[PDB]
Every structure is written in C-alpha cells, then in structure tokens.
Enzyme design. Structure first.
Site: not given
Ligand code: ANP
Ligand code: MG
Ligand code: MG
Length: 330
Positions: A93, A95-98, A227, A230
C-alpha cells in the site's frame, strides 16, 4: 559510488482522511521526520518526494518530480554504458507499483524511461552510431522465476556478465508502442499478491562506427527496474528476508565494520539476481516508499531504517564497452 536512496511519502488516502488517522510523516528538504503517535526521528536521504494531496494536479507533479530526479539520471547512465538499477521497497500500500509502473492516467518511472529512451535513440541515431534495445520482464514468486513475456526458469551467474535467468525471453523492440504492449502483457500476467517481485530489464546496445577505419564497437547500458514484494513482516519471503540481510551486511562493509562479513547473495533467487546491483558493477538507486499515517508507524520506521542503511552501500560501476568502442570516442 554509494547507492542513491530516496524516500517517497504517499499522500493520506480516503480512509486515513475519513477516519482522521494522525499523520506522523513530515518531509523537510532531503530529510524525513517520523513523529511519535517520544522525540521525532529524523533521517536524511538523497531525495525525499512528498505530496500535498491526491488531487490530479499533485499526482501529475509527483510522477514528474520522481522521473526528473531519478529517471533522467538512470537513463543517462544507460547511454553512458553503465549498468543501472532502481528498486522500490516498502510496505504493501505504500506506493511501490505506483512509483514504478504507475497508472494509465499517472504513468510511472518505467513508461517514462521507455518513452525517453526511444526518443533519445531516434534523435541520436545517425551513420556514425546506431542503437539496439531489448527488454525482458519476469517475476519471482515463492523463489521461482516466471517469464511475464511468455504465454520454471533458473538463475545462473555468468563468469563476466553476472547473474542472469537462463531461458528468459529477451525481445528486440523498435518503438515505445512495441515495449508498451509487452509491459501490458506482463502486467496482466503478474501473479495478484504483494508477495511477488517483478524485474523489468532494458539492454541498450550503442554501436559506434569509424567509417574511415571500417571499425565498430559496442557500449552496453542495462537498466533493471524492480518492483519488490511488500516489506511488511518461509520460502515465500526468503528473497525479501535475504535482501534485508544483504543490505545490512553491505552497509556494515561501507562503514568499516566487518571487512568480510558474509553477504548472502546466493541464499535467495532475488539477491543472487541483483548481486551486481548491490555492491557491484551498477549505478543503483533505492526508492523507499512509506505510508504517512499513525497506523503504519512501525513498518514505516522499519522502511526508513533500511533505506538509511542502503545509502552506505558502496558500488563499483564502470563503463561496459568493448576495446574498439573505447578508442572510437576521439
Ligand atoms: N505517491 C502517490 N500519490 C498518489 N497516490 C498514490 C501514491 N502512491 C500510491 N498511491 C495510491 O495508493 C495505491 C497503492 O499504491 P501501490 O503502488 O499499488 O502500493 P504497493 O506498494 O505496490 N502495494 P503492494 O504491491 O501490495 O506491495 C495506488 O494504487 C495509488 O492509488
Ligand atoms: Mg505493488
Ligand atoms: Mg556498470
């Protein structure tokens, strides 16, 4: 050089605002301040990225700032013939993939890197120099490797070119649209759990021609865009656990403690594959992603400390060019 480290704080999301979850992360120039839910903890990094809210405008500027600060330099590394790596690390959650892929409306590092690469090769191709681009895309899950570009495979360490996944598709691509359909095919194929690691690799082969001599030489840059699964806390986490051990040992080396402590690169698929990215022949940056609110305090603190040790890792990046390429410069 040292591994470059950035922390990216994602904005408070709707749940955290609706429920009034206390924000405990502040960004102050290149430092992160973690406030308690006694004293604030301050960590310094090479870059800190922060967002005021999740408005469309702040999202556009956020992805742009990350690329401007991290993607342009990594892209330039590849045109200079360095191996280079960005990996995203942090709790689910955060923001890694984002940060790495982004979304359709807010594309991240990888699409922007791919777009800039072909724009530069097309602008710079002439009769003295040409470029070849190849991509691979794979996932590590439960310590097994799968080819995301193939509708399983095992790691080997080559004597000169380093660790590689033997049998992995490495596809020649000639435009951004080519790479985009592969990204889209790969992203659909990714297993959908926070326990898998995805590695996107670009090899940029720059050929230089001496039309007076009839000679040519190659300079090769390689980009690894990772990427991670978690970071929140057997065979399923082994790669992540071992990455923490590898980072801690290497940080201890890059400060004087234990000249030859055991760095367990080969104890996991992930760390063996990224062996050169950490402590080897690579320009490497880490993007540590953190959540802002009180409910994630301890996982944030863990991510911050790990990022803090990574910036002490010493790498040894050299230009990868054959004999002719080196001399054809002048
Ligand atoms: N810097 C950012 N600015 C705005 N929205 C963000 C940002 N980072 C994350 N988000 C939001 O939060 C959500 C979760 O981010 P995401 O990059 O999917 O987390 P993650 O670290 O990859 N989780 P995971 O794959 O399960 O270990 C995204 O789909 C966006 O909607
Ligand atoms: Mg991810
Ligand atoms: Mg190099």
């Amino acid at each position: 050089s040292k591994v470059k480290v950035a922390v990216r704080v994602r904005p408070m999301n709707r749940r955290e605002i609706d429920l009034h979850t206390k924000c405990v992360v502040d960004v102050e120039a290149n430092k992160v301040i973690l406030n308690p839910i006694g004293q604030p903890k301050i960590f310094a990094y090479d870059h800190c990225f922060w967002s005021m809210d999740e408005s469309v405008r702040e999202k556009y500027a956020g992805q742009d700032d990350v690329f401007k600060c991290l993607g342009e330099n990594i892209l330039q590394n590849a045109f200079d013939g360095y191996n280079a790596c960005i990996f995203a690390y942090g709790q689910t959650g955060s923001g890694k993939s984002y940060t790495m892929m982004g979304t359709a409306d807010q594309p991240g590092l990888i699409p922007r890197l791919c777009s800039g690469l072909f724009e530069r090769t097309q602008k710079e191709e002439n009769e003295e120099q040409s470029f070849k681009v190849e991509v691979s895309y794979m996932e590590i899950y439960n310590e097994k490797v799968r080819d995301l570009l193939d509708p399983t495979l095992k790691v080997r360490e080559h004597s000169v070119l380093g660790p590689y996944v033997d049998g992995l598709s490495k596809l020649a691509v000639t435009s951004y649209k080519d790479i985009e359909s592969l990204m889209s095919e790969g992203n659909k194929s990714r297993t959908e759990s926070s326990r898998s690691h995805a590695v996107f690799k670009i090899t940029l082969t720059h050929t230089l021609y001496d039309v007076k001599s009839g000679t040519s030489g190659e300079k090769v840059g390689k980009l690894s865009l990772v990427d991670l699964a978690g970071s929140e806390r057997s065979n399923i986490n082994k790669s992540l656990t071992t990455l923490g051990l590898v980072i801690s040992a290497l940080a201890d080396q890059g400060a004087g403690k234990n000249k030859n402590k055991f760095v367990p690169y080969r104890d996991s698929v992930l760390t063996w594959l990224l062996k050169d990215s950490l402590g080897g022949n690579s320009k490497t940056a880490m993007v540590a992603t953190v959540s802002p609110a009180a409910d994630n305090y301890d996982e944030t603190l863990s991510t911050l400390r790990y990022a803090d040790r990574a910036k002490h890792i010493i790498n040894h990046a050299v230009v990868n060019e054959d004999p002719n390429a080196r001399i054809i410069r002048d």
